[model samples]
Target chain A: PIWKQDEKSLTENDYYSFYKNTFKAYDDPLAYVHFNVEGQISFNSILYIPGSLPWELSKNMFRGIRLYVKRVFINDKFSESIPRWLTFLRGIVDSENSKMLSIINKRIVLKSISMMKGLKETGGDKWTKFLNTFGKYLKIGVVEDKENQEEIASLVEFYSINSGDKKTDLDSYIENMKEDQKCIYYISGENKKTAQNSPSLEKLKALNYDVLFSLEPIDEFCLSSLTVNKYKGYEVLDVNKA
Target chain B: LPIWKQDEKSLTENDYYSFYKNTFKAYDDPLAYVHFNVEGQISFNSILYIPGSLPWELSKNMFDEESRGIRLYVKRVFINDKFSESIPRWLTFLRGIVDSENKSKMLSIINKRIVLKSISMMKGLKETGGDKWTKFLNTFGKYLKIGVVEDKENQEEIASLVEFYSINSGDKKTDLDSYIENMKEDQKCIYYISGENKKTAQNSPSLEKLKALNYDVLFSLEPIDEFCLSSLTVNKYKGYEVLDVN
Candidate 1:
């Protein structure tokens, strides 16, 4: 049976059962990204942030981010998975690359090996629809994770000049930025009225700085992490502090 | 000195006692009372008392509205009943009166004024033997523990007042100094265990090895008690460690 492993082995049924138990969705995940990044640093990660914010969003925001080693549960405290501000995110990342056990145990050969798995989206089209609903959290992740800033920056959604009301990706934003002037600018506040009336925008308006008004808190943090080279001297500053 | 004008203002000890009895509704008289004039940067006259026991309503009315127990007198005239904050909140259980000759002026900027005054008072309190005031801390010692945890500056003073239940004492409360005095020569560390109650803490498995070695351990019941013991780096005792039993 798939449950019974011979040395280092897992069958298709094992993978299916593991997914079902780990994610507990009505349907299977739409997609799964699994890889082992090695060389200078080796890490195996399996992440699954739910496609939609659950009905128990407020209360259960910090649940389901667990850590395991050789399937031995280490901690389910959700502290290691994501920052508190990004508690709305749901996922798991287990790293076999790092020596969790002390270095003294290195010489003591262990027979079993542990694999890390992360699940990203559950509920298929329903999950993507959920992302459309609560995508602001991913932007929060981008701001917090500076090392992987560019990777997460690629996932942000914006209402572009071309799309009108529709949401557009950073690829579209980048394409537009290339055509415009040297730097990319953004303004953020509580609402459109506040964002538009910001005193900081006065200089940008006069100089025609092509400022992107960001009314959400997560947007500013996300934009700040992007290097000057990546966004071409584009720096994000708070309008309220102006 | 300016010539004092007396408008027939006089009161006997008996009359003052009668007024105190009527106002405080006390069966017995206060233990001690002091009336003195204070002058420096500010000028004031104050009357303070050490009560025999806290009133029945004191604990209940502490954080409640209409709980201002101290009375404020300005130039021997009743100023306002609502004028509280004369004494610190921790000392609210004490009943007293303070009369100031100098009228308090309203600061143009309230926030800045308060911050400046608080910093000055803190520096003054530190220079003076403020820890001596800990003699009066018995009434609200738990609140002081909370204040220590909350306030970074006064932690050491607040920590000095903490008492815990010890296996060596055979009594209810034991200070760290007393515990060190009772320590066995070979015993390296001061051990402690915390639980919901004394009985549960006494029965904790982690204390088994220490108990076998005839080592005395402190039993902490309150949630804050363990934290208080842990916060101390080193006491009069040498190489003492506070360990939590999981």
Candidate 2:
């Protein structure tokens, strides 16, 4: 297995080639992580964040981990092995004991979430490219998973009425919020372009508040469900009717 | 094939039933359906079916464009079913086939015709009232309400097809026109009271006065009903203003 290969000897291309052959690869991975977990649930995994969104991306689409028990193929489409939102991740999870799959699942999700932050640190088209493709998946995590809500919320990006094309996260949105602004204001629409033109933002803009543009179907549920509707002590209000 | 060549009117109910069964692989008959042919700049034949039951995979994410469920074909050749623009998201529950030689602007026009056809189909189903209509309203009534809320161009027609549990209907859902027929002569507007359910809406003190006056009030149970009636273009149905009794 490519995941079992010595990490010290493998090049970026080796991982890329492994990803290309192992799964359906249209473009090289925008980012990927290969890590070995040694302990109670010993496992080796390689997960790829697809470079492009699938042409048929849907909630019902079959996705997630391809599990192997001691290098024997088990199931790739078993979604229980990972968070439903992280189903966008295609990878191999090889474990010695199937009984400890739950622990493997938790470790896999935590690693995948951190892999995103690793990309964020590099700072440029990589992060931007990542947001453009898999940004909505993080928002889904915020709505679907309670324990990881804050982490996923921080990772989720949105287009702002102020930012021309650059994507902004909750952290940036909060940082740039008005001094007296008690709530994190956002307006959701069909897309970023449509969200900016919303009449709801007129009053907010006049008051010099930066409103985040939520451009996905999951954005409303994601924003509304954020830490009991407050992200970092600030209430998240939709500008539509406020 | 036989589907494209046949005129929609010449086709029997059995033909429509068979189309639903064969295209979607349904074992049971559709609750209601519409089959039509459009001859224009982008010509095509289509048969849209409302499943006897909603798909288990149908999520509340109304904005998902990938699963429009209407297959698009060109010159009787298989194209794809994943057309996001071929129909509005509100009509996402629909499963059918559209055979056309098309693209961006052309697809947009086809979408326009499809919407019109869908509206006409619903109107036809409404006129052919019976168990089929009752079953349809029971199953896909929410979709029609959504169509009224989201689809402005066809809101007026879609508005008519919507069914609500009124104080008068007693477990059976009734349409707007049916209410108007039994409306009191002095009643100048359509009355409604919304709540989480029929029991709550029916028991509301707001309905006390209307009930005494023998006027019927629609029990707007679903949250979507409020949205469907609030939009300006659809607020008025046939000169009767729809008012919420708070």
Q: Reference contacts recovered by each candidate, as fractions?
A: 0.00, 0.00
Stretches of model 2 off by over 4 angstroms after superposition: A55-63, A190-199, B1-246
Model 1 chain A worst lDDT run, 10 consecutive residues? A109-118
> Candidate 1's error at B170, in angstroms?
1.4
Provide DockQ values for all models, in the order shown.
0.01, 0.01
How good is model 2 by TM-score?
0.46
Name the Cα RMSD for model 2: 29.1
lDDT of 2 at B226: 82
User: How much is A53 displaced in model 2, in angstroms?
Assistant: 2.4
Candidate 1 residue-wise lDDT at A4:
22
**Model 1 ranges with Cα > 4 A deviation:** A1-242, B1-22, B28-36, B65-67, B81-88, B103-141, B150-152, B183-191, B212-215, B224-246
The digit string of per-residue lDDT tens for model 1 on B1-246 reads: 110111113544555455456656766555444444434324555444544456555656544355455566666776654333432344344455556574122211221222223333333333342443333335545555554455454454455445677766654566665565566657657777776676666777787888888877887677566556666533322245656554
Interface C-alpha RMSD after superposing true interface residues, each candidate, one decimal = 26.1, 32.3
TM-scores of the models, in the given order?
0.35, 0.46
What is candidate 2's lDDT per residue for A111-180, written digit by digit as tens? 7887887687546788888887787777878888877787778888777887666767786676456656
Q: Name the docking class for model 2.
A: incorrect
